[PDB]
Design a protein around this ligand. Structure first.
Ligand SMILES: CN1Cc2c(N)cccc2[C@H](c2ccccc2)C1
Ligand SMILES: CN1Cc2c(N)cccc2[C@H](c2ccccc2)C1
Ligand SMILES: [Cl-]
Ligand SMILES: [Cl-]
Ligand code: NA
Ligand code: NA
Lengths: 565, 565
């Protein structure tokens, strides 16, 4: 009943997409995974794979969002047998909303604690840094250590602080006894959801202004951190270890599939955020150059974050008289346990720590805003009533996210966080992108998509894009699923071992999504009236062209549609 | 858009109201509380108080439900400043839906376990009766005991079975570590919610047929149990101890307020079930005689259940060579721990146990059906859309009840059950009935209510009913509220002591209801347009007569309305 909330400037759309793509996984996971699989020789399988897993699919979604001007759920009007895939992604970006706002609360506790001349992670004592009875010592200032991994050593002050204070993992023993939510984490999550609501209460009108600071400050932070790190003793060793080209790392499962998963999870394709952001652009906008630029900027950001992180790791290895392979870390530990440990060593640690934690806050906040905006836009385009009462809908979404995140802020919330992240994110987003690629390239057809893009922009996509859409991307989005299913390992923490029922609950969530897609399939199949072929023709044809089912001219049954390149 | 679902026969309405009024509190709580406060001399303060707390208020609600043909929420169109009270009760009957379906799962586990020639509660051994290492012995068959209360002795087989098997309280240590829900209790609760949905999916059309067996079988069960118990050694001692008139029990807080609360909680006024059941009757139905008959039948049922329970207690005291005061018990323990212990002693324990547990199932099932029907009818009359999709609404209500009852079926679910029951039921229903009485007798006026009843039935209520409506029932309710607030004790189990934060959460739920009523008050005050008096006149006048605010003729501001008797 009103024109759609088009972006005021395309710069806002670009900044939003970049802030969604750039994530903490580019900071903590990209450098370690790059150094593990041959160092610099990790880039050769990366970019090529990146190209596929980065260029068509993203473009496709963008093009989809540009052509089918709707949310993630109701974007499948061209093929009604895949709207469940539009539902699952909305649930996906919801499951990634429960635990990823707890990681933002972790960057706010550290920010509040950094407003002190003496940082708690510097040394031992009752600056909170809740200590264990088992010899809370100094890293290297007073006593040394031998034959131990500095990454997982939990007896340093910067490693005791994080766990014991923020997570209170000592008070818990596993997911069987989660305990009670931390009141400090509760207040941090309240502040997080409050700023999320205040940034997403009035639509993309506010988010396009917030992404100006949220998507540009981390770049300046990383630049200043690199400038400071390059002028540090021992950082050159870590930098040389980072870009150490080992071309003899030809093992497939170790390098290739890992790089593919890294690119696919870093770029963010499969949460509905891309379709939601592209549904707010003008019909004449060029989404091809936008997708290419966003992918290149994401890769450059990951590369410079890896440079900074490995310079810090080399500085730590030189200052602690240890090798660089030991300080190599990935995950929340590298950004919360090990990086503040290095920040505390340099002079003026307050400014560096405050800036680093504000950057960490912004990186998570942009991705959370993108995910919540995608969910809200999808559920509003699915049911138009919620589109009118956007304030109450956003408030309800944020409150449900806050209430369902209490299990991730409790004494044993890190276990639930890891379970949700791994199982939900991996399996759900893999199945979702596989179904999306199949539906767009086989049921709707690559020829129709190319014609839609030609209607959008004057230039038609080349043969390479269609070949990657139809035969390459669906082949590299099913191989990864088979590898993840076959090479699945039981859920394991640093030392804690998850009982079988936790893994069964994770696989139950995965299967819930992967049946909810066929649940909507069979729902659309049964909710129709007619014969078998008549029912099948109302789910593989465009809805706006459903009258063609009455005229009985269906091309999906024809061989030319399946053989169209 | 359609005629309301009027009851097919008034017999169905009577059976539904009787099955809602008759509850497990009449079975386990009424006899013990009657014997405690002077025995038979407990009846003299009872009935008189009963009369007030039984006759007008109930009648009022019924009359209200007969005049204002709507649910519990939207019954305050005569005074829009009290619809929040119609909301709170819907929440009340919801908070009593979470834990009271777990008590029904407790009567289904015992029913399934009773389908065996050798009952597990008869003796010790690995017939499940999960035993503790601390000397699992026989009650009196092998060894004796001295200076111990048989009610709370948890080392008998019938006392170890209930806790360790059904609740698994040994695996828990309090509300701080609730644990995981029991899969057997999970299946029992699934069966319970399934039969509740299948009985309430098509409205009162099915419930009126279900109450035929649900509200009449417990009476035959109690009759057969009395006939069996009177012909038992030592039952005469317990029967004489039951009706032992001690007229010197003149202490007020011990007898009077306890009997008042007993009547008020046993009759069920304050859950919205009465208004919901009266909104489905014909406009010419006589709700006065119906209310009187239902109250009298409830009292007679409580009396005969007390007779049967105390005959069983006397039999146990004679068979165990102990006094009758020791076996006196109230709550779930008397019906689950002590009564099956007596059933196992007699020959043919299988039939008696099966019949007793089917009666226990029906007693809880009728009350749960009444509460859920009240909630559904209220929320459907509040929002008419949910009235059309009644199947999906009932399914969602039952599923939310099942999901929010997992905290009451876990290893420490009995603590959450007691917390919810005590705090929510007591405080919320007290404040709700107080606000209802005040709004009906002071804002709407007893004269208007009497005129509405005269329009309903030919006879106008006498002066006694109006005097009890205006000055006696509200004052008695306020006195009970003040006593409950002042004489409040910290939450305590048999031996476990609740931490302060559990009591704070209970009082937080209580205060949530007792602000949600003023929340709707201030919402209606602010959502109006006009001056102060103009805004106030749109919340204390009938909605259908709101045009009188334009004509500026308001009687609530006049003194004749407040002085009307
Ligand atoms: C782009 N995203 C990638 C990703 C992956 N692959 C796994 C877990 C979290 C995330 C981040 C995210 C934040 C909020 C909602 C959805 C996703 C960013
Ligand atoms: C009449 N009711 C009285 C009562 C009280 N006073 C306290 C707790 C439970 C109950 C029972 C009930 C069952 C389901 C919904 C609401 C109430 C029956
Ligand atoms: Cl990446
Ligand atoms: Cl009673
Ligand atoms: Na970002
Ligand atoms: Na009943």
């Amino acid at each position: 009943a009103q024109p759609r909330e088009t972006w005021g400037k395309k710069i806002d759309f670009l900044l939003s997409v970049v802030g969604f793509a750039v994530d903490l996984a580019n900071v903590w996971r990209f450098p370690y995974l790059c150094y593990k699989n041959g160092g610099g020789a990790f880039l050769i399988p990366y970019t090529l794979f990146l190209i596929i897993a980065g260029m068509p699919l993203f473009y496709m979604e963008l093009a989809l969002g540009q052509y089918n001007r709707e949310g993630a759920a109701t974007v499948w009007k061209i093929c009604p047998f895949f709207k469940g895939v539009g539902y699952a992604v909305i649930l996906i970006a919801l499951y990634v909303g429960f635990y990823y706002n707890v990681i933002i609360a972790w960057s706010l506790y550290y920010l509040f604690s950094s407003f002190t001349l003496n940082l708690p992670w510097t040394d031992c004592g009752h600056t909170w840094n809740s200590p264990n009875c088992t010899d809370p010592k100094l890293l290297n200032g007073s006593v040394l250590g031998n034959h131990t991994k500095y990454s997982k050593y939990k007896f340093t002050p910067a490693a005791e602080f994080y766990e014991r204070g923020v997570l209170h993992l000592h008070e818990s023993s596993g997911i069987h006894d989660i305990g009670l939510p931390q009141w400090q984490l509760l207040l941090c999550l309240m502040v997080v959801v409050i700023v999320l609501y205040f940034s997403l209460w009035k639509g993309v009108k506010t988010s396009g202004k917030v992404v100006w600071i949220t998507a540009t400050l981390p770049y300046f932070v990383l630049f200043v951190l690199l400038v400071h790190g390059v002028t540090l003793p021992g950082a050159s060793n870590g930098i040389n270890a980072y870009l150490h080209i080992d071309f003899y790392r030809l093992k497939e499962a170790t390098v290739w599939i890992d790089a593919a998963t890294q690119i696919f999870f870093s770029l963010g394709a499969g949460f509905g955020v891309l379709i939601a952001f592209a549904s707010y652009n003008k019909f004449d906008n060029n989404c091809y150059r936008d997708a290419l630029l966003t992918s290149s900027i994401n890769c450059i950001t990951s590369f410079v974050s890896g440079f900074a992180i490995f310079s810090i790791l080399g500085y730590m290895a030189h200052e602690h008289k240890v090798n660089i392979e030991d300080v190599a870390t990935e995950g929340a530990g590298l950004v919360f346990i090990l990086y503040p440990e290095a920040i505390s060593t340099l002079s003026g640690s307050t400014f560096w720590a405050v800036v680093f934690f504000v950057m960490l806050l912004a990186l998570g906040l942009d991705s959370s805003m993108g995910g919540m905006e995608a969910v809200i836009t999808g559920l509003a385009d699915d049911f138009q009533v919620l589109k009118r009462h956007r304030k109450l809908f956003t408030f309800g979404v944020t409150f449900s996210t806050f209430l369902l995140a209490l299990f991730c802020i409790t004494k044993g919330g890190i276990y639930v966080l890891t379970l949700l992240d791994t199982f939900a994110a991996g399996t759900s987003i893999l199945f979702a992108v596989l179904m999306e690629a199949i539906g767009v390239s086989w049921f709707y057809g690559v020829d129709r998509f190319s014609n839609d893009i030609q209607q959008m922009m004057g230039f038609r996509p080349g043969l390479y894009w269609r070949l990657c859409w139809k035969f390459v991307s669906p082949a590299f989005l099913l191989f990864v699923v088979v590898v993840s299913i076959i090479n699945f390992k039981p859920l394991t923490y640093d030392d804690y071992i998850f009982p079988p029922w936790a893994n069964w609950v994770g696989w139950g969530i995965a299967l819930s999504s992967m049946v909810l897609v066929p649940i909507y399939v069979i729902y659309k199949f049964l909710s129709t009236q007619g014969s078998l072929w008549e029912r099948l023709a109302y789910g593989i044809t465009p809805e706006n062209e459903h009258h063609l089912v009455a005229q009985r001219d269906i091309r999906q049954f024809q061989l030319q549609h399946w053989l169209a390149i």
